[PDB]
Design a binder for this molecule. Structure first.
Ligand code: NAG
Lengths: 211, 171
């Protein structure tokens, strides 16, 4: 089996708000629907059971409800902490089921990244390879943009980004972009620059160095 | 205006030994999708104040035991009805739901008990029985068994050993 469709898939809302998550079902259930909260870096947490049951450890700012095939977790007085992925569940008479997920990001005022560039360590160059790591720190929204320019030509093939999960404290993100060349390719260019475009920036931002 | 529907369409039923009871007060009943509904192995009625919907799952050939003055594992040790009983026992086969390869472990019954159950009594304790002589002090094996047991409902089972969902209206 009995499939469950949670929606919306992503939800961005500011502190103190009231959010409402839905879960349409292939068929019907009763004291057998239950909601879960997976915070990042963390196992799942049961929030509501037997449809509307308050649970234990969870506060009364969380509340569930539903009939037949449509069910609804709602949080009120949204808090930074609350951001996570939320999951439906159904129970038995053949078959167990959750849903896709629903990610709840916590909207806030735009914060521009603090960019920081690290050139390759001597240790690494000895071992054959060069890595230049650009670091965008504490920003919102996610939706940022990094480019590597090398002797001013836009490099494409050989970088990889990694953004962190939203941070409960300041509801920001951080991100690394990492350009990896072989030592031999690395020595065929002089200037290495990291250009950035966030909504929080008036004009783009570069941090660059020389080999 | 009365519910029933919440009782009948219940996604999963109780184990017989912890049989579930929903209270029904303030209203009259329509009927229809009871009685005029077929798909019931049984629809037996015997013999208002206030009405009790008592739901649970048993085997096929235990259903005869959900009647006044009946005996056996269920009537004795899991769900007793009074002789007095004015009410309805409604049952239906649910193999397509409550049976699993392995043996759906969700349905249990009380195997052994010191005495019989009173009408409409429900015992949920799991203190080990003590069949022999020795004091058990919580363990089991040599005599001294554990009191509940699984129906282990599997698709291949004959009807005699298949899951039947039983609703017991009582007046
Ligand atoms: C069961 O029946 C009740 C009452 O007729 C109805 O409101 C409900 O939607 C039905 N289904 C479930 C899963 O409760």
């Amino acid at each position: 089996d009995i499939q469950m469709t949670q929606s919306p898939s992503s939800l961005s809302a500011s502190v103190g708000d009231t959010v409402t998550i839905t879960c349409r079902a292939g068929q019907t259930i009763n004291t057998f629907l239950n909601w879960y909260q997976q915070k990042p870096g963390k196992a799942p947490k049961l929030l509501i059971y037997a449809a509307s049951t308050l649970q234990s450890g969870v506060p009364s700012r969380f509340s569930g409800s539903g009939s037949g095939t449509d069910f609804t977790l709602t949080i009120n007085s949204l808090q930074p902490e609350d951001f996570a992925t939320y999951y439906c569940q159904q129970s038995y008479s053949n078959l167990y089921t959750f849903s896709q997920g629903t990610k709840v990001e916590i909207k806030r005022t735009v914060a521009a990244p603090s960019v920081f560039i690290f050139p390759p360590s001597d240790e690494q160059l000895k071992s054959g390879t060069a890595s230049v790591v650009c670091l965008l720190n504490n920003f919102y929204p996610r939706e940022a943009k990094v480019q590597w320019k090398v002797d001013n030509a836009l490099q494409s093939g050989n970088s990889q980004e990694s953004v962190t999960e939203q941070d409960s404290k300041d509801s920001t993100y951080s991100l690394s972009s990492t350009l990896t060349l072989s030592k031999a390719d690395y020595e065929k260019h002089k200037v290495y620059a990291c250009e950035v475009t966030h909504q929080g920036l008036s004009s783009p931002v570069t941090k660059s160095f020389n080999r | 205006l009365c519910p029933f529907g919440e009782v009948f369409n219940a996604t999963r039923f109780a184990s017989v030994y912890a049989w579930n009871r929903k209270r029904i007060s303030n209203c009259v009943a329509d009927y229809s999708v009871l009685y005029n509904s077929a798909s019931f192995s049984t629809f037996k009625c015997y013999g208002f104040t206030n009405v009790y919907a008592d739901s649970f799952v048993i085997r096929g050939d235990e259903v005869r035991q959900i009647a006044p003055g009946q005996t056996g594992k269920i009537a004795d040790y899991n769900y007793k009805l009074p002789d007095d009983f004015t009410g309805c026992v409604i049952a239906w086969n649910s193999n397509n739901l409550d049976s699993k390869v392995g043996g759906n472990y969700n349905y249990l019954y009380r195997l052994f008990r010191k005495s019989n159950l009173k009408p409409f009594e429900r015992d949920i304790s799991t203190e080990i029985y003590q069949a022999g002589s020795t004091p058990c002090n919580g363990v089991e094996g040599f005599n001294c068994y554990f009191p509940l047991q699984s129906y282990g409902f599997q698709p291949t089972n004959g009807v005699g050993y298949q899951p039947y969902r039983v609703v017991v209206l009582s007046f």
